[PDB]
């Protein structure tokens, strides 16, 4: 909006492996990661200066 | 039209680059400067001369 500082996008990474069944055997578990990436707005500015006998 | 004596053309070059916005700060200001450049009007002449007996 030209007043905002930065853009930001997300990122999520997924884990998990399987793992062979077993009745007695522990349960694997899932996870996952979140990261985030940020930009920041530039902003820029120019002019003119006009006379009258110019 | 044969006896005027130069052609010319018009260029124009503007100027100015911006810089980073400031609430505060001297507004740039743009500019432009005009060339004219010019080509001469060359004329020759060629003739001939016949006598009777030729």
Request: hydrophobic share 35%; aromatic share 8%; proline share 4%.
């Given at each position: ?8 996008q ?6 998990g ?38």
């Amino acid at each position: 909006s030209w007043e905002d500082q930065e853009i930001v996008q997300g990122i999520v990474e997924p884990a998990g492996t399987a793992v062979e069944y077993g009745d007695h055997t522990n349960i694997p578990l899932t996870s996952w990661n979140a990261n985030f990436e940020r930009r920041t707005i530039v902003r820029g500015e120019l002019g003119m200066m006009v006379g009258t006998l110019e």
